[PDB]
């Protein structure tokens, strides 16, 4: 298996490592209705037919409790990847500090 995350702006969204990024794009199409040809995806900070195994996505790297992540863009011209980071947690109470 390979559990994956995808992000774009404030918006967030698994397969087999043997699977390829195109079927993941098809999943993205079904979810958001932007066909794969108007989707482009980025592994790490790298703009991804590659099988998820050869994209670097591995189950040990892609567990459900620690899934992999991907950036997404659409043909608006594909926009520069815009992903808005999650809010940070507040200060840890001193009693809970190490």
């Amino acid at each position: 298996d390979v559990f994956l995350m995808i992000r774009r702006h404030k918006t967030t969204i698994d397969a087999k490592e043997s699977s390829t990024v195109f079927e993941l794009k098809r999943i993205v199409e079904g979810i958001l209705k932007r066909p794969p040809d108007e989707q482009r995806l980025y592994k790490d900070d790298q703009l991804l037919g590659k099988t998820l195994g050869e994209c670097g996505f591995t189950s040990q790297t892609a567990r459900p409790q620690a899934p992999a992540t991907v950036g997404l863009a659409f043909r608006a011209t594909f926009e520069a990847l815009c992903i808005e980071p999650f809010s940070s947690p507040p200060e840890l109470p001193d009693v809970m500090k190490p």
Binding site: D1, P64, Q65, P93
Partner: protein, 80 residues
């Protein structure tokens, strides 16, 4: 099939109704839900927890950080 979850801070997440139903609160509420109190990081961690619970239901390897721990406890109390 799918369901959308909005964090209090406006971050947005999508899963299958399947996983979201792991929360009793989700089942009580149900296409989309906005949690005007759950921050983005907590909501993302909860999505991870749903996926992990599904993947190891009646399987077990779950990480937690102290900073998010209290928020996670309160949010779990909220979401069953």
């Amino acid at each position: 099939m799918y369901v959308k979850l909005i964090s209090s801070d406006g971050h947005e997440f999508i899963v299958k109704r399947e996983h979201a139903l792991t929360s009793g609160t989700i089942k009580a509420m149900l296409n989309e839900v906005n949690f005007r109190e759950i921050p983005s990081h907590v909501l993302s961690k909860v999505c991870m927890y749903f996926t992990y619970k599904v993947r190891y239901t009646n399987s077990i390897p779950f990480p937690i950080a102290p900073e998010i721990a209290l928020e996670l406890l309160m949010a779990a109390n909220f979401l069953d």
